[model samples]
Target: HWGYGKHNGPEHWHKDFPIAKGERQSPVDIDTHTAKYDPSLKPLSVSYDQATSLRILNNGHAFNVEFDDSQDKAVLKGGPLDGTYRLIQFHFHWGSLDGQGSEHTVDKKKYAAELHLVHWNTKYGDFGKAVQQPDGLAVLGIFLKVGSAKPGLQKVVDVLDSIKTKGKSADFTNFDPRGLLPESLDYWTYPGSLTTPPLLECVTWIVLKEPISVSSEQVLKFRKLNFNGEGEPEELMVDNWRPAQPLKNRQIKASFK
Candidate 1:
């Protein structure tokens, strides 16, 4: 299976998931200088119903806050997307230390961590079917910097103890994910694929230009989580971020000038 370990990490992902070397691979370094400001882009609209928040799970890779995507209770629109998209789940990518975590970088500058809010286009029906199309998925990425305590983030961190190992899940409801967003909605948009395997090229990447704060202590607690299962050798789930892939000839568009 695919993992962040040396043997099964990103480098070896292409061996099994050949699309890992695809033209539109994600987690690309955002070179602000090279990014073009597109006046035609619209402001991103993200409306979430905290009541739709369901449970949290440790899926041997990243911890996810799953949502009840049955209806359009929580959705994301505009900003490089045509129709409405439903929020499915949100997860994080981090490093063993503070400065080398986030998947997408700004002018080669790395953040302490990155949070991804994943959504699937409704035009193609459900997430399973949408994932097979080129514009099926839309992932919003927010960078996290080490700083003061984020009261909103503390809610998620507090429950980390409940799901410390892979395959573990716990009840996590009524959590407003909007609290995790930064003050600005301006972003950089691109066409890319899932950073993890199977590296499908179905995502429209919208990375926020701003970053939210997270206490360094809370980040360390995240590192305490184990990638292994209940009875398996405890492997700390740190450095779970994929390195930057090539930008190829794809143009990076900015929402702000």
Candidate 2:
């Protein structure tokens, strides 16, 4: 199985998923000096319905908060996206400790954690079909630093206890994910792939400039989650983030100067 370990880690994923070495692979280092400020880029927007939140689950990798995306209840638009993209699920990538857990970095700087809000384009119909297109997905990445606790994420941490093992789930409803975002929408956009295995090159990455703060204790809570299932060998789900990949010939566009 694929994981963030030496045995079947990111560097070794190419064995099964050859796309891991693809040109548009994700989690690239954002060199602000090279990221051209694009005046044409619009401010990102989201219309999320609190009731669309379905459940929270530990999917053997990370804890994801899934949303009911049968309708346009929770949609993301503007920014680098050409059409409305429905928010399907949101998850996090954290480290074993404070300092270096984020996937995408700013000037080679890593954050304590990162949050990914996954949305699929409406034009392609459902997520399954959308993944096949080049502009299929738009992932909003928010960096998390070690500082004061954010009230918005407290609810998620509180529910972590129930899903200590992989495949475990709990009813998590009526949660507004926008609260987890930073005040500024200024972002860096680029063509990229999924950071994990089966790394499909169908994502438009929108990484925010401002990072939200989370207490050191809160990060510890995330590490408490186990990568193994109920009866498997216990493995802490830390350092689940992939290292920065080659940027290749792609240009990073910044929404702000």
Candidate 3:
């Protein structure tokens, strides 16, 4: 529906994706006090089979690290979820510069970047078919803070040079998604939609409270990415995040107080 620019940015997204005006739009501000603690919530469970880690793609929007989800080979089983949620892929939202970026903000504080691990419920079908139902998908959010480079993400950083333009991709296997997460499983959950086109409203957002560390030098490399494909006007990919939407009458449930 939109690209992040003055002519077709968030303000213009609603024109193509009417759902952008929907009540359940994602990337909502997650205030602790606004969220109710639910002891019934389970500790976030993640079981990813490294073999399922397929290739990565720079889908013009974000760098998607695709996965092989033909079956329940890998999944997320707990935390505000009902059925086995199969891992479909993971991607990120970042800025050309730090100090301000990320999708979901906490108490109005923005993280340098955000990571989303998109999953689909087995009760439904593939991500395409599943996105139509209310409980069809669940995306786990991890906030990335500016700090020393994390050894955990060395491999991901090393490949940025190769996937610098849209449509570029390379083999990204044997990589564990767990390495990208914090030790704590505490998270805030809510109802929302896709932050991009079509803006489907089937997501049950599970945003982790803790932030992971990454280096400024590593993040700056992301700024070099070109949004347009080869020989195009070379638009730099940045501020690719959508502004936080309204909370409406939805509930913000938390696994911890």
Error of 2 at 228 (Å): 0.2
Cα error, candidate 3, residue 217 (Å): 1.3
lDDT of 1 by residue, 139-241 (tens): 9999999999788898899999999999899999899998898889999999999899888999999999999989988899999999999989889999999
Alpha-carbon lDDT of model 2: 0.93
lDDT of each: 0.93, 0.93, 0.87
For residues 1-257, write the lDDT of model 2, one tens digit per residue: 99988898987999999998889999999999999999998888877754389999999999999999998888889998899899999999998878799999999999999999999999998999988899999999999999999999999999999999989999999898978989898999999998998799999999999999999888999999999999899999999999999999899999999
Task: Show where candidate 2 strays beyond 4 Å.
Answer: 49-51
User: Where does candidate 3 stray beyond 4 Å?
Assistant: 49-51
Worst 10 residues of 2 by lDDT: 43-52
lDDT tens readout by residue for model 3, 15-134: 888889998999899888878999999888888754378788888888998888997877998888898999989998997667777999999988889999999998876788899998
Relative to the true structure, candidate 2 reaches a TM of: 0.98
> What TM-score goes with each of the models?
0.98, 0.98, 0.97
C-alpha RMSD of each candidate structure in angstroms: 0.9, 0.9, 1.2
The TM-score obtained by model 3 is 0.97
